[PDB]
CSV table of N, CA and C in Angstrom, one decimal:
chain,number,residue,atom,x,y,z
A,1353,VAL,N,-96.5,164.9,19.6
A,1353,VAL,CA,-95.5,164.5,18.6
A,1353,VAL,C,-93.8,164.1,19.4
A,1354,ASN,N,-93.1,163.9,18.4
A,1354,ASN,CA,-92.0,163.3,19.2
A,1354,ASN,C,-91.0,165.0,19.6
A,1355,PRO,N,-90.0,164.8,20.4
A,1355,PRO,CA,-89.1,165.4,20.7
A,1355,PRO,C,-88.0,165.9,19.1
A,1356,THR,N,-88.0,167.5,19.6
A,1356,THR,CA,-87.1,168.1,19.1
A,1356,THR,C,-85.7,168.3,19.5
A,1357,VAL,N,-84.4,168.2,19.6
A,1357,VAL,CA,-83.8,168.4,20.2
A,1357,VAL,C,-82.5,169.0,19.0
A,1358,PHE,N,-81.8,170.1,20.3
A,1358,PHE,CA,-80.5,170.6,18.9
A,1358,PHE,C,-79.3,171.3,19.8
A,1359,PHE,N,-77.8,170.5,19.0
A,1359,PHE,CA,-76.7,170.9,19.9
A,1359,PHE,C,-76.3,172.0,18.5
A,1360,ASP,N,-75.9,173.3,19.7
A,1360,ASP,CA,-74.8,173.9,19.2
A,1360,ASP,C,-73.5,173.8,19.2
A,1361,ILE,N,-73.1,173.6,18.2
A,1361,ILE,CA,-71.3,173.5,18.2
A,1361,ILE,C,-70.3,174.3,17.4
A,1362,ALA,N,-69.5,174.2,18.6
A,1362,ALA,CA,-68.2,174.8,18.4
A,1362,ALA,C,-66.5,173.9,18.1
A,1363,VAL,N,-65.9,174.5,17.6
A,1363,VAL,CA,-64.6,174.0,17.3
A,1363,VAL,C,-63.1,174.9,17.9
A,1364,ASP,N,-62.5,174.0,18.7
A,1364,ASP,CA,-61.9,175.0,19.6
A,1364,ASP,C,-62.4,176.7,19.8
A,1365,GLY,N,-63.8,176.4,19.9
A,1365,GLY,CA,-64.5,178.2,21.0
A,1365,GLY,C,-64.6,178.7,19.7
A,1366,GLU,N,-64.7,178.3,18.4
A,1366,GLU,CA,-65.3,178.8,17.0
A,1366,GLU,C,-67.0,178.4,17.5
A,1367,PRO,N,-67.9,179.4,17.0
A,1367,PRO,CA,-69.0,178.6,16.4
A,1367,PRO,C,-69.0,178.3,15.6
A,1368,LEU,N,-69.2,177.2,15.4
A,1368,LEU,CA,-69.6,175.9,13.9
A,1368,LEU,C,-71.2,176.4,13.4
A,1369,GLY,N,-72.1,176.2,14.3
A,1369,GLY,CA,-73.7,176.0,13.4
A,1369,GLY,C,-73.8,175.4,14.6
A,1370,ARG,N,-75.7,175.2,14.1
A,1370,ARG,CA,-77.0,173.8,15.0
A,1370,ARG,C,-77.6,172.7,14.1
A,1371,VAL,N,-77.5,171.6,15.2
A,1371,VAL,CA,-78.0,170.5,14.6
A,1371,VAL,C,-79.5,170.1,15.6
A,1372,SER,N,-80.3,169.8,14.7
A,1372,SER,CA,-81.7,169.7,15.5
A,1372,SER,C,-81.3,168.5,15.0
A,1373,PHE,N,-82.3,167.5,16.0
A,1373,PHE,CA,-82.4,165.8,16.2
A,1373,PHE,C,-84.4,165.5,16.7
A,1374,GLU,N,-84.4,164.7,15.5
A,1374,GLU,CA,-85.7,163.9,15.9
A,1374,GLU,C,-85.4,162.8,16.8
A,1375,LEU,N,-86.2,162.9,17.8
A,1375,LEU,CA,-86.2,161.6,19.0
A,1375,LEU,C,-86.6,161.1,18.9
A,1376,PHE,N,-86.3,160.0,18.2
A,1376,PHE,CA,-88.3,158.5,18.4
A,1376,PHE,C,-88.9,158.3,19.3
A,1377,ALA,N,-89.2,159.0,19.9
A,1377,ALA,CA,-90.3,158.4,21.5
A,1377,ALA,C,-91.4,157.7,21.0
A,1378,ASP,N,-91.8,157.6,19.8
A,1378,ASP,CA,-93.3,156.7,19.7
A,1378,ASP,C,-92.4,155.6,19.2
A,1379,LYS,N,-91.6,155.2,19.6
A,1379,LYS,CA,-90.9,153.8,19.4
A,1379,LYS,C,-90.2,153.4,19.9
A,1380,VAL,N,-89.0,154.7,20.7
A,1380,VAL,CA,-87.7,153.8,21.8
A,1380,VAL,C,-88.1,155.4,22.6
A,1381,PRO,N,-89.5,155.1,23.6
A,1381,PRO,CA,-89.6,156.1,24.3
A,1381,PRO,C,-88.4,156.3,25.7
A,1382,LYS,N,-87.6,155.0,26.1
A,1382,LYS,CA,-86.8,155.1,27.2
A,1382,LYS,C,-85.1,155.4,27.1
A,1383,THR,N,-85.5,155.4,25.6
A,1383,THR,CA,-84.0,156.0,25.1
A,1383,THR,C,-83.9,157.2,25.0
A,1384,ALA,N,-85.1,157.6,24.1
A,1384,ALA,CA,-85.5,159.1,23.7
A,1384,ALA,C,-85.0,159.6,24.8
A,1385,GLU,N,-86.0,160.0,26.3
A,1385,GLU,CA,-86.0,160.7,27.2
A,1385,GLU,C,-85.2,160.3,27.9
A,1386,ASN,N,-84.2,160.1,27.7
A,1386,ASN,CA,-83.0,159.6,28.0
A,1386,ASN,C,-81.6,161.1,27.5
A,1387,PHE,N,-81.6,161.3,26.2
A,1387,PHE,CA,-81.5,161.6,25.2
A,1387,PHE,C,-81.8,163.6,25.4
A,1388,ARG,N,-83.0,163.6,25.0
A,1388,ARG,CA,-83.6,164.7,26.0
A,1388,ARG,C,-83.4,165.4,26.8
A,1389,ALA,N,-83.8,164.6,28.0
A,1389,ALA,CA,-82.7,165.2,29.1
A,1389,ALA,C,-81.7,165.8,29.3
A,1390,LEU,N,-80.7,165.2,29.2
A,1390,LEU,CA,-79.0,164.9,28.9
A,1390,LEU,C,-79.1,166.4,28.1
A,1391,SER,N,-79.9,166.3,27.1
A,1391,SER,CA,-79.1,167.8,26.3
A,1391,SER,C,-80.1,169.3,27.0
A,1392,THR,N,-81.5,169.1,28.2
A,1392,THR,CA,-81.9,170.1,28.8
A,1392,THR,C,-81.2,170.6,29.6
A,1393,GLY,N,-80.6,168.9,30.2
A,1393,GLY,CA,-80.1,169.2,31.8
A,1393,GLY,C,-81.0,170.1,33.0
A,1394,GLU,N,-81.8,168.9,32.7
A,1394,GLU,CA,-82.8,169.2,34.0
A,1394,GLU,C,-82.9,168.5,34.9
A,1395,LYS,N,-81.8,167.3,34.6
A,1395,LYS,CA,-81.5,166.6,36.1
A,1395,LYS,C,-80.3,166.4,36.5
A,1396,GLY,N,-80.0,168.2,36.5
A,1396,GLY,CA,-78.7,168.8,37.2
A,1396,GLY,C,-77.4,167.8,36.4
A,1397,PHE,N,-77.6,167.2,35.6
A,1397,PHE,CA,-76.6,167.5,34.5
A,1397,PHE,C,-76.4,166.6,32.8
A,1398,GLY,N,-75.6,166.7,32.2
A,1398,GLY,CA,-76.1,166.7,30.6
A,1398,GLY,C,-74.9,167.2,29.9
A,1399,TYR,N,-75.0,167.4,29.1
A,1399,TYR,CA,-73.9,167.1,27.3
A,1399,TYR,C,-73.5,168.8,27.4
A,1400,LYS,N,-74.4,169.9,27.5
A,1400,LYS,CA,-74.2,171.2,28.0
A,1400,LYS,C,-72.3,171.6,27.7
A,1401,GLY,N,-71.7,172.0,27.3
A,1401,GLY,CA,-70.1,171.9,27.7
A,1401,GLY,C,-69.4,170.4,27.5
A,1402,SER,N,-69.7,169.3,27.0
A,1402,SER,CA,-68.9,168.4,26.4
A,1402,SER,C,-68.9,168.2,25.3
A,1403,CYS,N,-67.5,167.2,25.1
A,1403,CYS,CA,-67.2,167.6,23.6
A,1403,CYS,C,-67.5,165.9,23.1
A,1404,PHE,N,-67.2,166.0,21.5
A,1404,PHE,CA,-67.3,164.5,20.3
A,1404,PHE,C,-66.0,164.0,20.5
A,1405,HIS,N,-65.3,163.5,21.6
A,1405,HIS,CA,-63.7,163.2,21.5
A,1405,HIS,C,-63.9,162.1,20.1
A,1406,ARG,N,-64.7,162.0,19.8
A,1406,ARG,CA,-64.1,160.9,18.7
A,1406,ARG,C,-64.8,161.0,17.3
A,1407,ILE,N,-64.1,160.8,16.3
A,1407,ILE,CA,-64.9,161.3,14.7
A,1407,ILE,C,-63.6,160.7,14.2
A,1408,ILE,N,-64.7,159.6,12.8
A,1408,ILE,CA,-63.9,159.0,11.9
A,1408,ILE,C,-64.7,159.4,10.7
A,1409,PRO,N,-64.4,160.2,9.5
A,1409,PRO,CA,-64.2,160.7,8.6
A,1409,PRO,C,-65.1,158.9,7.5
A,1410,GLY,N,-66.3,159.3,7.0
A,1410,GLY,CA,-67.3,157.7,6.9
A,1410,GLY,C,-67.8,157.1,7.1
A,1411,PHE,N,-67.6,157.1,8.5
A,1411,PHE,CA,-68.0,156.3,10.0
A,1411,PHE,C,-69.1,157.3,10.7
A,1412,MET,N,-68.5,157.7,11.6
A,1412,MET,CA,-69.2,158.3,12.5
A,1412,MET,C,-69.1,159.6,13.9
A,1413,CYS,N,-70.1,160.1,14.4
A,1413,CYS,CA,-68.9,161.1,14.9
A,1413,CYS,C,-69.6,161.1,17.0
A,1414,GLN,N,-68.3,160.9,17.6
A,1414,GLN,CA,-69.2,160.3,18.5
A,1414,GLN,C,-69.0,160.7,19.6
A,1415,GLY,N,-69.9,161.4,20.5
A,1415,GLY,CA,-69.7,162.4,21.4
A,1415,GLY,C,-70.4,161.5,23.0
A,1416,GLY,N,-70.8,162.7,24.2
A,1416,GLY,CA,-71.8,161.9,25.1
A,1416,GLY,C,-71.0,162.1,26.7
A,1417,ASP,N,-69.7,161.7,26.3
A,1417,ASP,CA,-69.0,161.6,27.8
A,1417,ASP,C,-68.5,162.7,28.3
A,1418,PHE,N,-69.8,162.8,28.9
A,1418,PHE,CA,-68.9,164.3,30.0
A,1418,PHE,C,-68.8,164.2,31.3
A,1419,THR,N,-68.8,163.0,31.9
A,1419,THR,CA,-67.7,163.0,32.5
A,1419,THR,C,-66.4,162.5,33.1
A,1420,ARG,N,-65.9,162.3,31.8
A,1420,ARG,CA,-64.2,161.7,31.1
A,1420,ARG,C,-64.2,162.2,30.0
A,1421,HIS,N,-65.0,162.4,29.2
A,1421,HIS,CA,-64.1,163.3,28.4
A,1421,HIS,C,-63.1,162.6,26.7
A,1422,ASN,N,-63.6,161.3,27.4
A,1422,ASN,CA,-62.1,160.1,26.4
A,1422,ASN,C,-63.1,158.9,25.8
A,1423,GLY,N,-64.5,158.9,26.4
A,1423,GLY,CA,-65.3,157.9,26.0
A,1423,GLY,C,-64.5,156.3,27.1
A,1424,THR,N,-64.2,156.7,27.9
A,1424,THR,CA,-65.0,155.9,29.4
A,1424,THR,C,-66.3,156.0,30.5
A,1425,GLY,N,-66.5,157.4,30.0
A,1425,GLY,CA,-67.2,157.6,31.1
A,1425,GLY,C,-68.5,158.2,31.1
A,1426,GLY,N,-69.2,159.1,31.4
A,1426,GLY,CA,-71.2,159.2,31.1
A,1426,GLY,C,-71.6,158.4,31.8
A,1427,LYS,N,-72.7,158.6,31.8
A,1427,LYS,CA,-74.3,158.1,32.6
A,1427,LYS,C,-75.5,158.3,32.7
A,1428,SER,N,-76.2,157.6,32.0
A,1428,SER,CA,-77.3,158.0,32.3
A,1428,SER,C,-78.4,158.4,33.3
A,1429,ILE,N,-79.9,158.7,33.0
A,1429,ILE,CA,-80.5,159.8,33.7
A,1429,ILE,C,-81.1,158.5,34.9
A,1430,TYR,N,-80.5,157.4,34.3
A,1430,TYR,CA,-81.9,156.4,34.7
A,1430,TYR,C,-80.6,155.7,35.6
A,1431,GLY,N,-79.3,156.1,36.1
A,1431,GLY,CA,-78.1,155.4,36.5
A,1431,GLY,C,-76.7,155.2,35.6
A,1432,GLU,N,-76.1,154.4,36.2
A,1432,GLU,CA,-74.6,154.2,35.5
A,1432,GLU,C,-74.8,153.5,33.9
A,1433,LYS,N,-75.5,152.3,33.6
A,1433,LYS,CA,-76.3,151.7,32.4
A,1433,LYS,C,-77.8,151.3,32.9
A,1434,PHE,N,-78.1,151.4,31.4
A,1434,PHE,CA,-79.3,150.8,31.4
A,1434,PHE,C,-79.7,150.0,30.5
A,1435,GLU,N,-80.6,149.1,30.2
A,1435,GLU,CA,-80.8,148.2,28.7
A,1435,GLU,C,-80.9,149.1,28.0
A,1436,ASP,N,-80.6,147.8,26.7
A,1436,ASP,CA,-81.3,147.9,24.9
A,1436,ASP,C,-82.7,148.2,25.2
A,1437,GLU,N,-83.7,148.7,24.5
A,1437,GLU,CA,-85.0,148.8,24.8
A,1437,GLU,C,-85.9,148.2,23.9
A,1438,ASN,N,-84.8,148.3,22.6
A,1438,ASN,CA,-85.4,147.7,21.6
A,1438,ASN,C,-83.9,147.6,20.3
A,1439,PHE,N,-84.9,146.6,19.0
A,1439,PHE,CA,-84.1,147.2,18.0
A,1439,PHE,C,-85.0,147.5,17.0
A,1440,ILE,N,-86.0,148.2,17.3
A,1440,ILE,CA,-87.4,147.8,15.6
A,1440,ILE,C,-86.1,148.9,14.5
A,1441,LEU,N,-84.9,150.0,14.9
A,1441,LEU,CA,-85.2,151.0,14.0
A,1441,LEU,C,-84.0,150.8,13.7
A,1442,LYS,N,-83.0,150.9,12.2
A,1442,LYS,CA,-82.2,150.5,11.6
A,1442,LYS,C,-81.2,151.5,11.5
A,1443,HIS,N,-79.7,151.2,11.2
A,1443,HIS,CA,-78.5,151.9,10.3
A,1443,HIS,C,-79.3,152.3,9.4
A,1444,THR,N,-79.8,152.9,8.9
A,1444,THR,CA,-79.6,152.8,7.3
A,1444,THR,C,-78.9,154.2,6.5
A,1445,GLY,N,-78.6,154.9,7.4
A,1445,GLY,CA,-77.7,156.0,6.3
A,1445,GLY,C,-77.1,156.8,7.7
A,1446,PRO,N,-76.5,157.8,6.8
A,1446,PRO,CA,-76.1,159.7,7.1
A,1446,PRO,C,-77.0,160.2,8.4
A,1447,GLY,N,-77.2,160.4,9.4
A,1447,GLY,CA,-77.7,161.4,10.2
A,1447,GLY,C,-78.8,160.1,10.5
A,1448,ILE,N,-78.3,159.0,11.5
A,1448,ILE,CA,-79.2,158.4,12.5
A,1448,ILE,C,-78.5,158.4,13.4
A,1449,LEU,N,-79.2,158.5,15.0
A,1449,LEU,CA,-78.9,158.6,15.7
A,1449,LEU,C,-78.8,158.2,17.0
A,1450,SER,N,-78.0,157.0,17.3
A,1450,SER,CA,-77.5,155.3,17.6
A,1450,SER,C,-76.4,155.2,18.6
A,1451,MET,N,-76.6,155.4,20.2
A,1451,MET,CA,-76.4,154.7,21.4
A,1451,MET,C,-74.9,154.1,21.2
A,1452,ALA,N,-74.2,154.2,21.7
A,1452,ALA,CA,-72.6,154.0,22.5
A,1452,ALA,C,-73.6,152.5,23.6
A,1453,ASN,N,-71.9,151.7,23.2
A,1453,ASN,CA,-72.1,150.4,24.3
A,1453,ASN,C,-71.2,150.3,24.2
A,1454,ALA,N,-71.2,148.6,26.1
A,1454,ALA,CA,-69.9,148.2,25.5
A,1454,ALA,C,-70.5,147.0,26.0
A,1455,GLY,N,-71.4,146.6,25.2
A,1455,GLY,CA,-71.9,145.0,25.4
A,1455,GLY,C,-73.3,145.1,25.6
A,1456,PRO,N,-73.9,143.8,26.2
A,1456,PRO,CA,-75.2,144.4,25.8
A,1456,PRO,C,-76.0,144.4,27.4
A,1457,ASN,N,-76.7,146.3,27.3
A,1457,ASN,CA,-77.5,146.5,28.6
A,1457,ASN,C,-76.7,147.6,29.3
A,1458,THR,N,-76.1,148.0,28.1
A,1458,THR,CA,-75.0,148.8,29.0
A,1458,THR,C,-75.0,150.7,28.8
A,1459,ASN,N,-75.6,150.4,28.6
A,1459,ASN,CA,-76.3,152.3,27.7
A,1459,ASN,C,-76.3,153.5,29.2
A,1460,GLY,N,-75.3,154.2,28.5
A,1460,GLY,CA,-75.2,155.5,29.2
A,1460,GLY,C,-75.7,156.6,28.6
A,1461,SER,N,-74.5,157.8,28.5
A,1461,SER,CA,-75.1,158.8,28.1
A,1461,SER,C,-74.2,158.6,26.6
A,1462,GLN,N,-73.5,158.0,26.2
A,1462,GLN,CA,-72.6,158.2,24.5
A,1462,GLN,C,-73.6,157.7,23.9
A,1463,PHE,N,-73.6,158.2,22.2
A,1463,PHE,CA,-74.5,158.1,21.5
A,1463,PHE,C,-73.0,158.0,20.5
A,1464,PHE,N,-73.6,157.9,19.2
A,1464,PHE,CA,-73.1,158.9,17.9
A,1464,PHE,C,-74.0,158.7,16.9
A,1465,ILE,N,-73.3,160.0,16.4
A,1465,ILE,CA,-74.6,160.5,15.0
A,1465,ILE,C,-73.2,159.6,13.4
A,1466,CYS,N,-74.0,158.7,12.6
A,1466,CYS,CA,-73.8,158.4,11.6
A,1466,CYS,C,-73.5,159.3,10.1
A,1467,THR,N,-72.2,159.1,10.0
A,1467,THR,CA,-72.1,159.5,8.8
A,1467,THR,C,-72.4,159.0,7.5
A,1468,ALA,N,-72.5,157.5,8.3
A,1468,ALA,CA,-72.9,156.2,7.1
A,1468,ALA,C,-73.3,155.9,7.0
A,1469,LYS,N,-74.0,154.4,5.9
A,1469,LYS,CA,-75.1,153.3,6.4
A,1469,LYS,C,-74.1,152.2,6.9
A,1470,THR,N,-74.6,151.7,7.9
A,1470,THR,CA,-73.8,150.9,9.0
A,1470,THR,C,-74.7,149.8,9.5
A,1471,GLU,N,-74.7,149.3,8.6
A,1471,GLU,CA,-75.7,148.7,8.7
A,1471,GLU,C,-75.2,147.3,9.5
A,1472,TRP,N,-74.0,146.8,10.3
A,1472,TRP,CA,-73.3,145.9,11.0
A,1472,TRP,C,-73.6,146.3,12.1
A,1473,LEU,N,-74.8,147.4,12.6
A,1473,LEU,CA,-74.0,147.1,14.2
A,1473,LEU,C,-76.1,146.9,14.4
A,1474,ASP,N,-76.6,147.1,12.7
A,1474,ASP,CA,-78.3,146.9,13.5
A,1474,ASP,C,-78.2,145.5,14.4
A,1475,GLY,N,-79.3,145.8,16.0
A,1475,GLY,CA,-79.3,145.0,17.0
A,1475,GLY,C,-78.1,144.6,17.4
A,1476,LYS,N,-77.1,145.4,17.4
A,1476,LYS,CA,-76.3,145.8,18.7
A,1476,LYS,C,-76.7,146.9,19.3
A,1477,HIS,N,-76.6,147.8,18.3
A,1477,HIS,CA,-76.7,149.4,19.1
A,1477,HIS,C,-78.0,150.1,18.8
A,1478,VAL,N,-79.0,149.9,20.0
A,1478,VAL,CA,-80.3,150.8,20.0
A,1478,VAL,C,-80.6,152.0,18.7
A,1479,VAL,N,-81.0,152.0,18.0
A,1479,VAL,CA,-81.3,153.8,17.3
A,1479,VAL,C,-82.7,154.5,18.0
A,1480,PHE,N,-82.4,155.6,18.2
A,1480,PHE,CA,-83.3,156.5,18.6
A,1480,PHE,C,-83.7,157.4,18.4
A,1481,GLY,N,-82.8,157.9,16.9
A,1481,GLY,CA,-83.7,159.3,16.7
A,1481,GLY,C,-82.7,159.5,15.2
A,1482,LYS,N,-82.9,161.1,14.4
A,1482,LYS,CA,-82.1,161.3,13.2
A,1482,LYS,C,-81.8,162.5,12.9
A,1483,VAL,N,-81.2,163.4,12.4
A,1483,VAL,CA,-80.5,164.7,12.7
A,1483,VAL,C,-82.0,165.5,11.6
A,1484,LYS,N,-82.7,166.4,12.1
A,1484,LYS,CA,-83.8,166.7,11.1
A,1484,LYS,C,-83.1,168.1,10.9
A,1485,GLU,N,-82.5,168.9,10.8
A,1485,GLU,CA,-82.2,169.9,10.4
A,1485,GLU,C,-80.2,170.1,10.7
A,1486,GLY,N,-79.3,170.5,9.7
A,1486,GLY,CA,-78.2,170.9,9.7
A,1486,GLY,C,-76.9,170.2,9.5
A,1487,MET,N,-78.0,168.4,8.9
A,1487,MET,CA,-76.8,167.3,8.3
A,1487,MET,C,-75.2,168.3,7.9
A,1488,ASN,N,-75.6,169.8,7.2
A,1488,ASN,CA,-74.1,170.3,6.9
A,1488,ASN,C,-73.3,170.0,8.1
A,1489,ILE,N,-73.9,170.7,8.9
A,1489,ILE,CA,-72.9,171.2,10.1
A,1489,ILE,C,-72.4,169.9,10.7
A,1490,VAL,N,-72.8,168.5,10.4
A,1490,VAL,CA,-72.4,167.1,11.0
A,1490,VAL,C,-71.2,167.0,9.9
A,1491,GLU,N,-71.6,167.1,8.9
A,1491,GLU,CA,-70.4,166.8,7.7
A,1491,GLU,C,-69.2,168.1,7.8
A,1492,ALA,N,-69.6,169.3,8.0
A,1492,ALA,CA,-68.3,169.7,8.4
A,1492,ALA,C,-67.5,169.4,9.8
A,1493,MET,N,-67.9,169.2,10.8
A,1493,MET,CA,-67.3,168.3,12.1
A,1493,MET,C,-66.4,167.1,11.4
A,1494,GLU,N,-67.1,166.5,10.5
A,1494,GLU,CA,-66.3,165.6,10.1
A,1494,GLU,C,-65.4,165.7,9.4
A,1495,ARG,N,-64.8,166.9,9.5
A,1495,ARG,CA,-63.7,166.8,8.2
A,1495,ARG,C,-62.5,167.7,9.6
A,1496,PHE,N,-62.7,167.5,10.6
A,1496,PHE,CA,-62.0,167.5,11.8
A,1496,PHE,C,-61.6,166.2,12.6
A,1497,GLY,N,-62.2,165.0,12.2
A,1497,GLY,CA,-61.8,163.8,12.1
A,1497,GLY,C,-60.4,163.2,11.7
A,1498,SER,N,-60.6,161.8,11.8
A,1498,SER,CA,-59.0,161.2,11.3
A,1498,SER,C,-59.5,159.7,11.4
A,1499,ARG,N,-58.5,159.0,10.7
A,1499,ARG,CA,-59.0,157.7,10.6
A,1499,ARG,C,-59.0,157.0,12.0
A,1500,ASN,N,-57.9,157.3,12.7
A,1500,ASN,CA,-57.9,156.7,14.5
A,1500,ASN,C,-58.7,157.4,14.8
A,1501,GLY,N,-59.7,158.1,14.7
A,1501,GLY,CA,-61.1,159.2,15.2
A,1501,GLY,C,-60.6,160.4,16.2
A,1502,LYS,N,-58.9,160.7,15.9
A,1502,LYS,CA,-58.3,162.1,16.6
A,1502,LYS,C,-58.9,162.9,16.5
A,1503,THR,N,-59.4,163.7,16.7
A,1503,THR,CA,-59.9,165.1,16.2
A,1503,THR,C,-58.8,166.2,16.2
A,1504,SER,N,-58.3,166.3,15.1
A,1504,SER,CA,-57.3,167.8,15.4
A,1504,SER,C,-57.7,169.1,16.2
A,1505,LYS,N,-59.1,169.1,16.4
A,1505,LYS,CA,-59.3,171.1,16.9
A,1505,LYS,C,-60.4,170.3,18.0
A,1506,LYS,N,-60.7,170.7,18.6
A,1506,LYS,CA,-61.7,170.3,20.1
A,1506,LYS,C,-62.9,170.8,19.5
A,1507,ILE,N,-63.9,169.8,19.5
A,1507,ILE,CA,-65.4,169.9,19.5
A,1507,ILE,C,-66.4,170.1,20.3
A,1508,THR,N,-67.2,170.9,20.3
A,1508,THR,CA,-67.8,170.8,21.2
A,1508,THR,C,-69.1,171.1,21.4
A,1509,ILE,N,-69.8,170.8,22.4
A,1509,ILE,CA,-71.5,171.4,22.6
A,1509,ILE,C,-71.6,172.7,22.7
A,1510,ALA,N,-71.0,173.2,23.0
A,1510,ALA,CA,-71.2,174.9,23.4
A,1510,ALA,C,-72.9,175.2,23.9
A,1511,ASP,N,-74.0,174.9,24.2
A,1511,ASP,CA,-75.3,175.1,24.2
A,1511,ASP,C,-76.3,173.8,22.6
A,1512,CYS,N,-76.8,173.6,24.1
A,1512,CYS,CA,-77.9,172.5,24.5
A,1512,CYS,C,-78.9,172.7,24.4
A,1513,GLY,N,-80.8,172.2,23.9
A,1513,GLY,CA,-82.0,172.4,24.9
A,1513,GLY,C,-82.6,171.3,23.7
A,1514,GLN,N,-84.3,172.1,24.2
A,1514,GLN,CA,-85.3,170.8,23.7
A,1514,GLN,C,-85.4,172.4,22.4
A,1515,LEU,N,-86.6,172.2,21.1
A,1515,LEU,CA,-86.6,173.1,20.7
A,1515,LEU,C,-88.3,172.9,20.1
């Protein structure tokens, strides 16, 4: 079946709670595997200790830049970038997990958790999972965002792995 991965979220080092994601390996196996492996760290690098650098309430939470912590870095398990696998799945509402990118076929490690329906991203960003448990924790994280995306406290992935 599809893998489930968890993030344990901290706010300025204090524990907030746990989010778990279902990864749609049955429909986007290469994209799901990248996120899974970065969550376990099994390749020697990944998300543990990294931050959510951009949070816009009513839009999305963005993270995954574990090399420069500000949206300019990250890398995939396949190299610096990899292709758009397919666009079968759509941005249907809160909880959707989708890849950030900088143009066609530029996926790395950055991702965003949607907190609203974002249909204008359909066909441009690859959807590859959804929040399974802990959407309330995503809602709590949202409250530390701002209109321009800067967070008022440091939101980090204190631990992560596969359930």
